[PDB]
Amino acid sequence: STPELRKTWLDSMARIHVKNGDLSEAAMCYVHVTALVAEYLTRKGVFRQGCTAFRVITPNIDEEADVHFNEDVLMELLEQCADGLWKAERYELIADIYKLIIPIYEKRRDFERLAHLYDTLHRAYSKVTEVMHSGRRLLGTYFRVAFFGQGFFEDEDGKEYIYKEPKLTPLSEISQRLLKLYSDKFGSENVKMIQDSGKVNPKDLDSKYAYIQVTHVIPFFDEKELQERKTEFERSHNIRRFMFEMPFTQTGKRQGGVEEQCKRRTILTAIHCFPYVKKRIPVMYQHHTDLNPIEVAIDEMSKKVAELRQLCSSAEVDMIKLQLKLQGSVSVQVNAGPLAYARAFLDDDNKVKLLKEVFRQFVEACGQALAVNERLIKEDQLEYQEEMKANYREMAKELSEIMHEQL
């Protein structure tokens, strides 16, 4: 009766996820229950595959390795996973469930059930093209969370998690929520937020306090993964690794001038993939890679050319967002400006070469952005557009003074 007991726990977890609006975690709970019934029934010779058939839906399925269990029960559970995944807005995964039941319905000649599942699949793929175009699907945002204070957290002390939050939950929201939660259960004066995103050395914490560290992360993928995961959905599903970028300087640290600014990229690996049957998952392993100030400079410049390109390459261009980015490259008011990188590194280690390359595409990109904007502006700008053009010319002149080149 372990299988029955596991189902009971998973069913109970799912209900809570449903009340909380965490419908992907409910859906994984349905999938895990269905996987365990399928495993059981395949062993009995009643169904042709167990657990591993669901691995495409979630690698976490490995964790699951009566006449309360039979074909009818499996069928209803499959139907539940399909509707569960619909509600979680993970449309792309519905066919993986339905492939498992289709042959059963065919064998039973149940044509009304076949009609129903195909209608769902059609709607699912329609939603997919729809949200792929509109960006209105928000599958969640992620944070590293770690607690500190033996006296307060008991066993939770020092443990790091990745938290998967609903929709577009911002740092300000989760950090204030957790601050509240524990302020309430320990007293506001005994709870401290650690803002520093670096490793916290416990030896410099005050035992008198409960500390909470929250840091925003995004899913991380290497080159090989970026090539296998070709859509936003595929980069939002079955994700185990997360990354954030932290400023430092050698004289330690964080925020400095361009000449001194380093960056540490930290990759964190969770023990399970998201989404899972829980919305927070222990960190298993981590590591990092540091970049030089010239490397940081190269990094930021590239993300800017790619950005301006994407904006221009669009079928239909978003003018405001194009203007936001263009203005902020050529008409900088507040920050140091793109040129500060050129002065600091391109004024007469030979990966100086590469920063030069990037700056070459940047001037062309801003160039393209101007051309595009010219055709979108409705006169009431035009002066605005003129200035940016003037700014852009001026800027090109200087980069030549520095790179001794055209542009």
Binding site: S134, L171, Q255, V258, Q261, D318, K321, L324, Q333, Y341
Partner: protein
């Protein structure tokens, strides 16, 4: 279909922490933790009434060196954010004396909100002392709300980039005002 990109222009004095709070919010980083950028302006996607929205935050220089160029970015604006620090009486003053005059000169009918910043400094002993020696106290919400209704601001919102308190709400309201 394609998601819609609200234009929000941010103005206010130069040492009230306005850029800091734009960067903190849009990068989801505490003020001390973000990688500095040499670029200006920020985009962030926010969910309002169940729907996503791209918010374009156009930053401006608050200095006089820029009175000429700044207003160029004012055409096409859907909403204004007028920022002052609640522990800086001159900031507040400039809202009345320079900032709302300027934006309503150019965009008479575009909504704006009054944004109070650095609210975590109302509690700072040293800051309160510095204000005391000039017979001043930090601006309260009450006094800020007043200025907001008198100036015809849609409303007053305030926040601390440091503690993250009120930060999300500030830009939720900016989007609500643009709609």
């Amino acid at each position: 279909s394609h998601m819609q990109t609200i234009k929000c222009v941010v103005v206010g004095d130069g040492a009230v922490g306005k850029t800091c709070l734009l960067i903190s919010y849009t990068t989801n980083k505490f003020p001390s933790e973000y990688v500095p950028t040499v670029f200006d302006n920020y985009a962030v996607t926010v969910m309002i009434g169940g729907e996503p929205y791209t918010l374009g935050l156009f930053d401006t220089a608050g200095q006089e060196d820029y009175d000429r160029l700044r207003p160029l970015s004012y055409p096409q604006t859907d909403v204004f954010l007028v920022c002052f620090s609640v522990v800086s009486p001159s900031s507040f003053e400039n809202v009345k004396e320079k900032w709302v005059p300027e934006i309503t000169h150019h965009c008479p009918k575009t909504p704006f909100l009054l944004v109070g910043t650095q609210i975590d400094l109302r509690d700072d002993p040293s800051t309160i002392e510095k204000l005391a020696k000039n017979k001043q106290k930090p601006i309260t919400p009450e006094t800020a709300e007043k200025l907001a209704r008198d100036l015809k601001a849609v409303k007053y919102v305030e926040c601390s980039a440091l503690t993250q308190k009120g930060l999300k709400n500030v830009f939720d309201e900016a989007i609500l005002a643009a709609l």
